[PDB]
PDB file of all heavy atoms in Angstrom:
ATOM      1  N   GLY C 229      95.584 114.612  75.021  1.00  0.00           N
ATOM      2  CA  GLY C 229      95.558 113.517  75.988  1.00  0.00           C
ATOM      3  C   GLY C 229      96.628 112.480  75.736  1.00  0.00           C
ATOM      4  O   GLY C 229      96.440 111.288  76.194  1.00  0.00           O
ATOM      5  N   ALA C 230      97.766 112.814  75.120  1.00  0.00           N
ATOM      6  CA  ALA C 230      98.792 111.918  74.709  1.00  0.00           C
ATOM      7  C   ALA C 230      99.814 111.760  75.888  1.00  0.00           C
ATOM      8  O   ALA C 230     100.997 112.062  75.736  1.00  0.00           O
ATOM      9  CB  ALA C 230      99.421 112.377  73.405  1.00  0.00           C
ATOM     10  N   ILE C 231      99.249 111.433  76.999  1.00  0.00           N
ATOM     11  CA  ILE C 231      99.986 111.474  78.331  1.00  0.00           C
ATOM     12  C   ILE C 231     100.786 110.218  78.523  1.00  0.00           C
ATOM     13  O   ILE C 231     100.367 109.137  78.020  1.00  0.00           O
ATOM     14  CB  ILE C 231      99.026 111.688  79.517  1.00  0.00           C
ATOM     15  CG1 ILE C 231      97.927 110.565  79.519  1.00  0.00           C
ATOM     16  CG2 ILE C 231      98.488 113.098  79.488  1.00  0.00           C
ATOM     17  CD1 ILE C 231      97.277 110.403  80.856  1.00  0.00           C
ATOM     18  N   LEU C 232     101.843 110.295  79.293  1.00  0.00           N
ATOM     19  CA  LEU C 232     102.632 109.145  79.755  1.00  0.00           C
ATOM     20  C   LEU C 232     101.932 108.560  80.933  1.00  0.00           C
ATOM     21  O   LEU C 232     101.637 109.298  81.889  1.00  0.00           O
ATOM     22  CB  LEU C 232     104.045 109.597  80.025  1.00  0.00           C
ATOM     23  CG  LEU C 232     105.051 108.452  80.269  1.00  0.00           C
ATOM     24  CD1 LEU C 232     105.261 107.586  78.959  1.00  0.00           C
ATOM     25  CD2 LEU C 232     106.440 109.002  80.638  1.00  0.00           C
ATOM     26  N   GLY C 233     101.597 107.307  80.869  1.00  0.00           N
ATOM     27  CA  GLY C 233     101.035 106.549  81.984  1.00  0.00           C
ATOM     28  C   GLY C 233     102.002 106.476  83.189  1.00  0.00           C
ATOM     29  O   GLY C 233     103.222 106.447  83.026  1.00  0.00           O
ATOM     30  N   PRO C 234     101.468 106.385  84.434  1.00  0.00           N
ATOM     31  CA  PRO C 234     102.251 106.427  85.632  1.00  0.00           C
ATOM     32  C   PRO C 234     103.371 105.292  85.691  1.00  0.00           C
ATOM     33  O   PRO C 234     104.434 105.581  86.223  1.00  0.00           O
ATOM     34  CB  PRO C 234     101.205 106.230  86.772  1.00  0.00           C
ATOM     35  CG  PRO C 234      99.946 106.674  86.135  1.00  0.00           C
ATOM     36  CD  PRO C 234     100.000 106.275  84.690  1.00  0.00           C
ATOM     37  N   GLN C 235     103.045 104.074  85.340  1.00  0.00           N
ATOM     38  CA  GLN C 235     103.994 102.938  85.337  1.00  0.00           C
ATOM     39  C   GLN C 235     105.163 103.260  84.362  1.00  0.00           C
ATOM     40  O   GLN C 235     106.273 103.083  84.660  1.00  0.00           O
ATOM     41  CB  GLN C 235     103.266 101.691  84.933  1.00  0.00           C
ATOM     42  CG  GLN C 235     103.990 100.392  85.174  1.00  0.00           C
ATOM     43  CD  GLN C 235     103.404  99.576  86.313  1.00  0.00           C
ATOM     44  OE1 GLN C 235     102.181  99.301  86.393  1.00  0.00           O
ATOM     45  NE2 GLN C 235     104.290  99.134  87.204  1.00  0.00           N
ATOM     46  N   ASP C 236     104.834 103.800  83.163  1.00  0.00           N
ATOM     47  CA  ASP C 236     105.860 104.266  82.227  1.00  0.00           C
ATOM     48  C   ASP C 236     106.665 105.467  82.839  1.00  0.00           C
ATOM     49  O   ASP C 236     107.852 105.478  82.709  1.00  0.00           O
ATOM     50  CB  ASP C 236     105.323 104.473  80.861  1.00  0.00           C
ATOM     51  CG  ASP C 236     104.934 103.169  80.113  1.00  0.00           C
ATOM     52  OD1 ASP C 236     105.376 102.094  80.625  1.00  0.00           O
ATOM     53  OD2 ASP C 236     104.268 103.273  79.078  1.00  0.00           O
ATOM     54  N   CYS C 237     106.064 106.459  83.490  1.00  0.00           N
ATOM     55  CA  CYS C 237     106.815 107.546  84.191  1.00  0.00           C
ATOM     56  C   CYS C 237     107.820 106.898  85.146  1.00  0.00           C
ATOM     57  O   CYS C 237     108.970 107.355  85.099  1.00  0.00           O
ATOM     58  CB  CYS C 237     105.833 108.383  84.973  1.00  0.00           C
ATOM     59  SG  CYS C 237     104.729 109.392  83.900  1.00  0.00           S
ATOM     60  N   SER C 238     107.424 105.925  85.887  1.00  0.00           N
ATOM     61  CA  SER C 238     108.292 105.255  86.883  1.00  0.00           C
ATOM     62  C   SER C 238     109.541 104.608  86.197  1.00  0.00           C
ATOM     63  O   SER C 238     110.596 104.654  86.749  1.00  0.00           O
ATOM     64  CB  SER C 238     107.475 104.178  87.571  1.00  0.00           C
ATOM     65  OG  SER C 238     108.234 103.692  88.692  1.00  0.00           O
ATOM     66  N   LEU C 239     109.330 104.040  85.020  1.00  0.00           N
ATOM     67  CA  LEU C 239     110.506 103.480  84.374  1.00  0.00           C
ATOM     68  C   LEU C 239     111.423 104.581  83.884  1.00  0.00           C
ATOM     69  O   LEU C 239     112.633 104.430  83.923  1.00  0.00           O
ATOM     70  CB  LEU C 239     110.052 102.595  83.189  1.00  0.00           C
ATOM     71  CG  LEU C 239     109.384 101.325  83.621  1.00  0.00           C
ATOM     72  CD1 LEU C 239     108.855 100.580  82.402  1.00  0.00           C
ATOM     73  CD2 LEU C 239     110.383 100.431  84.372  1.00  0.00           C
ATOM     74  N   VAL C 240     110.863 105.746  83.462  1.00  0.00           N
ATOM     75  CA  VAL C 240     111.716 106.884  83.004  1.00  0.00           C
ATOM     76  C   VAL C 240     112.415 107.463  84.215  1.00  0.00           C
ATOM     77  O   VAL C 240     113.606 107.741  84.112  1.00  0.00           O
ATOM     78  CB  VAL C 240     110.886 107.948  82.249  1.00  0.00           C
ATOM     79  CG1 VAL C 240     111.710 109.114  81.799  1.00  0.00           C
ATOM     80  CG2 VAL C 240     110.130 107.369  81.058  1.00  0.00           C
ATOM     81  N   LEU C 241     111.737 107.663  85.307  1.00  0.00           N
ATOM     82  CA  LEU C 241     112.279 108.146  86.589  1.00  0.00           C
ATOM     83  C   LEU C 241     113.456 107.264  87.026  1.00  0.00           C
ATOM     84  O   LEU C 241     114.567 107.780  87.413  1.00  0.00           O
ATOM     85  CB  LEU C 241     111.290 108.164  87.680  1.00  0.00           C
ATOM     86  CG  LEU C 241     110.278 109.327  87.612  1.00  0.00           C
ATOM     87  CD1 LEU C 241     109.105 109.080  88.571  1.00  0.00           C
ATOM     88  CD2 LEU C 241     110.948 110.621  87.927  1.00  0.00           C
ATOM     89  N   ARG C 242     113.293 105.967  86.897  1.00  0.00           N
ATOM     90  CA  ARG C 242     114.347 104.966  87.292  1.00  0.00           C
ATOM     91  C   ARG C 242     115.574 105.148  86.334  1.00  0.00           C
ATOM     92  O   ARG C 242     116.760 105.146  86.833  1.00  0.00           O
ATOM     93  CB  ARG C 242     113.881 103.590  87.227  1.00  0.00           C
ATOM     94  CG  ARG C 242     114.825 102.531  87.717  1.00  0.00           C
ATOM     95  CD  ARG C 242     114.277 101.122  87.536  1.00  0.00           C
ATOM     96  NE  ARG C 242     114.706 100.138  88.535  1.00  0.00           N
ATOM     97  CZ  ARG C 242     115.600  99.172  88.319  1.00  0.00           C
ATOM     98  NH1 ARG C 242     116.302  99.112  87.186  1.00  0.00           N
ATOM     99  NH2 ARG C 242     115.894  98.257  89.306  1.00  0.00           N
ATOM    100  N   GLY C 243     115.328 105.240  85.059  1.00  0.00           N
ATOM    101  CA  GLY C 243     116.362 105.415  84.036  1.00  0.00           C
ATOM    102  C   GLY C 243     117.203 106.641  84.275  1.00  0.00           C
ATOM    103  O   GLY C 243     118.375 106.587  84.101  1.00  0.00           O
ATOM    104  N   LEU C 244     116.528 107.743  84.583  1.00  0.00           N
ATOM    105  CA  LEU C 244     117.146 109.121  84.792  1.00  0.00           C
ATOM    106  C   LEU C 244     118.274 109.026  85.853  1.00  0.00           C
ATOM    107  O   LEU C 244     119.208 109.837  85.789  1.00  0.00           O
ATOM    108  CB  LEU C 244     116.174 110.098  85.330  1.00  0.00           C
ATOM    109  CG  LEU C 244     115.508 110.956  84.271  1.00  0.00           C
ATOM    110  CD1 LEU C 244     114.201 111.505  84.892  1.00  0.00           C
ATOM    111  CD2 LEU C 244     116.485 112.023  83.821  1.00  0.00           C
TER     112      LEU C 244
END
Side-chain angles (χ1 to χ4, degrees):
Chain C
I231 55 160
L232 190 62
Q235 194 110 48
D236 289 347
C237 292
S238 191
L239 289 174
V240 179
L241 284 169
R242 186 185 209 257
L244 266 161

